[PDB]
């Protein structure tokens, strides 16, 4: 095991939880993995797959992103910071995708899922781009139960890192779609204390966070250092106590360790 893996193992030991990390350095397509093949609950990081699946649809339905979607009182769930502003009005699928990706809006996630025909349509898009690991089984917010050992709504760090690379830096999407996903991710507002907090602050970052029960605290990021090929970093973390507190600092610390090596 490398020096970076020993430092990640020590961070994990210090934290009392279970840490999964996958880095892809696209300059060499080298990988750094820590529990990279173990399953973790994705929580809201699954929003990237859902938004990208709608973007993939928009390659054929050219005006799909401007299609209005009604926001109704029954659509509201546990956390709806943007959609609650539009109850009994409408939001476009673009406005819903931005709400999901930039504010972690769970109503917006559910509208994306509905546009895809259910959670099976999100998983289908994962399989269509070569991700055999991702599975989405539930809508928001029950996809965040993060129960230890439950295979529902999980992926592995290695698989999520590979998928995030193909969506944002590869060509799993069309050029306008991929650029739109990059813009949305760069504009995320919920990640300041997660991967972003452990990285040199002249690196541009796009990321999507997630949180759930068992103190599950997740972040997935595409990172553009200046003068270097970009990297993809996935950091997943979960804890033994059902009511455990969020630990965004562990994700920052993992990113910092990765950025060193
Ligand atoms: C996705 O992770 C979403 N999580 C939830 O709705 C959870 N039920 C939850 C966990 C902890 C606190 C509140 C809700 C949304 N994304 C989260 C995130 O980006 O970390 C969230 C906490 C903003 S809600």
Author numbering: 26 to 57, 59 to 238, 240 to 252, 254 to 289
The authors write:
The CTX-M β-lactamases are class A enzymes that have a broad substrate specificity that includes penicillins and cephalosporins, including the oxyimino-cephalosporin cefotaxime. Acylation is facilitated by the transfer of a proton from Ser130, via a proton shuttle from Lys73, to the leaving group nitrogen of the amide. In addition, Lys234 is located near the proton shuttle residue, Ser130, and may act to lower the pKa of the serine hydroxyl to facilitate proton transfer to the nitrogen leaving group of the β-lactam during the acylation reaction. Structural results suggest that the slow acylation by the K234R enzyme is due to a conformational change in Ser130, and this change also leads to decreased inhibition potency of clavulanic acid.
The structure of the E166A/K234R enzyme acylated by ampicillin was determined to 1.6 Å resolution with one molecule in the asymmetric unit. The E166A substitution blocks the deacylation reaction, which allows trapping of the acyl-enzyme intermediate. As anticipated, the structure reveals ampicillin covalently bound to the enzyme via Ser70, as indicated by an Fo − Fc omit map. The carbonyl oxygen of the acyl-group makes hydrogen bonds to Ser70 and Ser237 main-chain nitrogens to form the oxyanion hole. The C3 carboxyl group of ampicillin also forms hydrogen bonds to the side chains of Ser130, Thr235, and Ser237. The Ser130 OH is likely a hydrogen bond donor to the C3 carboxylate oxygen with a distance of 2.8 Å. In addition, the Ser130 hydroxyl group is oriented toward Arg234 and forms two hydrogen bonds with guanidinium nitrogens. This Ser130 rotamer is the same as that observed in the E166A/K234R apoenzyme with a χ1 value of −60°. The Ser130 Oγ is 3.6 Å from the leaving group N4 nitrogen of the β-lactam ring and at an unfavorable angle for hydrogen bonding. In the −64° χ1 rotamer conformation of Ser130 in the E166A/K234R/AMP structure, the serine oxygen is 5.7 Å from the Lys73 Nζ, which is too distant for proton transfer.
